[PDB]
């Protein structure tokens, strides 16, 4: 489609995963404060998942002057 139109719930659980982590916790470790839906649980790691990675690549990037 791709109407992935993903309820509004899973939408929230998505954006929480990608928030700043300034205390460095690991997607793991932030799913086990609360205890979440498994499809919340499963959309909060593939969100914080990209995002940490994401971040990561662009500060590789940015050391390198590659970027910012």
């Given at each position: 489609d791709k109407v992935?139109?993903?309820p509004k719930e899973l939408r929230?659980?998505?954006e929480d995963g990608m928030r700043e982590?300034?205390?460095r916790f690991s997607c793991q470790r932030?799913?086990?404060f609360i205890?979440?839906?498994e499809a919340?649980?499963?959309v909060f790691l593939d969100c914080c998942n990209y995002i940490t990675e994401l971040?990561?690549?662009h500060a590789r990037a940015s050391?390198?002057?590659l970027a910012r």
């Open positions: 992935g139109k993903y929230k659980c998505c982590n300034p205390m932030r799913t086990r205890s979440l839906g919340c649980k499963k971040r990561r690549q050391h390198l002057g």
